[PDB]
Amino acid sequence: SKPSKRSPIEDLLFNKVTLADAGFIKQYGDCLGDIAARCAQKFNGLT
Amino acid sequence: VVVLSFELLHAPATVCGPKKSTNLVKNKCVNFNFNGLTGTGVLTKSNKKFLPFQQFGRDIVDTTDAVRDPQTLEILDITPCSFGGVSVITPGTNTSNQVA
Numbered sequence: 001s002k003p004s005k006r007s008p009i010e011d012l013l014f015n016k017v018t019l020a021d022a023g024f025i026k027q028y029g030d031c032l033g034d035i036a037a038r039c040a041q042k043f044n045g046l047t
Numbered sequence: 048v049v050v051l052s053f054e055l056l057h058a059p060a061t062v063c064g065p066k067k068s069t070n071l072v073k074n075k076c077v078n079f080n081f082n083g084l085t086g087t088g089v090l091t092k093s094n095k096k097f098l099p100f101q102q103f104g105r106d107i108v109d110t111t112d113a114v115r116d117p118q119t120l121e122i123l124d125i126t127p128c129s130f131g132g133v134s135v136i137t138p139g140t141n142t143s144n145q146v147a
């Protein structure tokens with residue numbers, strides 16, 4: 001019944017762990033945030 | 048003997064270059080020189096509120112994030128121009144020379 005077709009236990013495991021990086025395309029974000037907030041935010045060459 | 052003593056670490060300078068000012072490009076990716084601070088990036092309207100004595104701002108990692116325009120006092124955010132890695136997908140030169 002839920003997206004990703006994970007078990008009740010797997011969603012619990014995923015909700016408990018906080019992922020700092022979560023790699024995906026991030027260039028679209030750019031500014032308008034309170035601050036850039038990163039872990040280079042790509043800008044310093046680390047992805 | 049004449050000794051000229053100054054510090055270049057104070058952002059709101061009021062003294063020193065016979066440079067010829069031009070317009071502000073804003074959104075398009077450009078090179079810039081703001082009171083001796085130079086670089087490449089995209090200048091956009093900022094929502095940040097600078098104090099009367101603050102010319103420059105910095106991000107979490109102490110690099111320049113935003114500037115105060117020397118003539119208009121508009122606060123502009125500086126986002127570096129888009130860049131990234133290039134990866135080459137090759138079937139192998141013994142099969143085909145097509146590349147993604």
Ligand SMILES: *[C@@H]1O[C@H](CO)[C@@H](O)[C@H](O)[C@H]1NC(C)=O
Binds near residue numbers: 117118
């Ligand atoms: C600089 O001169 C322009 C001339 O139109 C004026 O509008 C602007 O406010 C001036 N800025 C400062 C900081 O004196």
